[PDB]
Each structure stands twice: as C-alpha cells, then as structure tokens.
C-alpha cells in the first residue's frame with residue numbers, strides 16, 4: 001500500500017506491466033520507476049507521457065523500489081546484479097522477468113552482497129497491457145510465503161497468475177510467452193484472407209480478432225476440450241469442416257507445435273549458454 005515498484009529495464013515488457021498496473025488501479029503512474037539505458041523513444045518517451053519516473057541510473061531505480069523488476073535482455077542481467085547487488089536492501093523483492101535466466105544464477109551471484117536476497121522468477125507477455133496477460137512465477141529460496149502472495153496478487157491484477165515449478169518456466173515461455181506473437185501473426189493472416197474475399201481491411205482485422213477472443217472464452221469458461229468445441233461449430237455440410245480440412249492439409253497444428261518447441265528450445269539455449277560463457 002505504501003508500495004512502489006521499479007523496472008531496472010524498460011522497453012516493451014516494462015511499458016506493458018507499467019501500463020497494465022496503472023490501469024488496473026493498483027499503483028500510480030508517478031509511484032513507479034524505470035531506468036533508461038539510452039532511451040528508445042517508443043518505450044521511454046511513452047512512459048513519460050504516461051507519468052512514470054524514468055532515470056538513466058538503474059540505481060536510483062533500485063532505491064526507489066520496494067518491488068524490483070528485472071526487465072532486461074537475458075545476458076545483460078549479470079552486468080546488473082553485480083552493479084546493483086550492493087544497493088539491494090532487504091525490504092524489496094526482486095522479480096526477474098528476463099527469459100531463461102534461472103533464479104539460482106541470480107541468487108548465487110547476488111548473495112555475494114547480502115545474506116539472503118528475496119527473489120522470484122517471472123514469466124509474462126505483452127497483453128498485460130490490458131488484463132489478459134498470462135503470467136507464471138516461481139518463488140526463490142529466500143522467499144517467504146508472504147512474498148508469493150504479494151506477487152500472485154500484483155500480477156493477478158493484470159492477467160492470469162500461478163506458482164510454477166521453475167523447471168516448467170521454459171515451456172511456458174514458448175506457449176503463453178511467445179504466443180501473443182503467434183496470434184498477432186495469425187490475425188494479420190486472417191485479415192489478409194478475409195480481405196481476399198471482399199471484406200474491407202479494418203472490418204476484417206476486427207472480425208478476425210473478435211473471432212479468436214470469443215473462441216478463447218468458450219474454452220476457458222468450460223472444459224469441453226478444444227477438440228469438442230471444434231465439433232460444436234462444424235455442421236456436416238461444410239463451410240467450416242471444409243476450412244479445417246485445408247488447415248489440416250498443411251500441418252497447421254504441426255506448425256504451431258514447431259513454434260512452441262522452437263520458443264522453448266531457444267530459451268533453454270539462451271540460458272544454458274549463459275551458464276558458462
């Protein structure tokens with residue numbers, strides 16, 4: 001309540017959470033702070049008009065925060081923990097949202113400046129900008145049951161949230177992590193298609209969007225199985241079971257696996273390649 005939050009990073013994910021948080025009415029524009037190593041107009045300048053506090057020193061950020069978010073490229077993290085670790089008091093919890101980066105590698109490198117650092121590994125996606133982001137997290141070792149709560153609550157204010165045994169955090173990144181981009185790509189497609197049919201552009205994009213959204217809900221607000229909802233929507237005639245067949249004919253499912261697998265396998269590498277060199 002007397003809480004403040006900071007993003008040692010910036011860019012999208014920062015802006016994402018920051019935007020979601022303010023809107024969710026949990027924090028306050030000014031009661032947040034993100035550091036601008038350089039300043040990327042889009043991101044940075046955006047936050048400015050938003051109301052957040054931006055400083056070139058991802059240090060004042062650490063002092064200004066009760067809850068610290070590590071939102072920087074995975075390989076950058078090291079060049080931070082050993083630049084801020086010293087400034088890591090005990091009051092604050094450190095939530096690293098960087099991909100692949102292990103809770104361990106952070107603690108056992110950050111502890112070198114503190115007996116027991118409080119850290120949690122996060123995994124979110126851009127949709128947080130609304131309240132439909134899908135977030136997963138894992139509690140550190142020096143993380144009290146009162147921290148997961150604060151976490152599981154600060155995030156549940158902007159999307160979905162659940163404790164997850166870190167070893168899973170890598171798959172999750174493929175699915176819900178990258179997912180929003182597999183979607184943005186699939187929408188653009190559909191529009192283009194709907195358009196190659198007579199529908200105007202704006203109109204097409206919105207129907208495509210709406211179509212997806214709706215599908216989501218039905219699936220979430222029930223079990224059924226994505227399999228069955230497919231059945232409920234296709235009359236023996238055609239019009240749909242037909243479109244399916246086409247998708248089904250070009251390994252449409254196959255290609256989505258291929259992309260989650262890829263997202264994962266990559267995230268593994270990025271980290272399991274930062275373990276040594």
Ligand SMILES: N[C@@H](CCC(=O)O)C(=O)O
Pocket residue numbers: 156
């Ligand atoms: N935390 C709520 C958010 C919203 C709603 O459905 O109204 C949920 O996912 O159940």
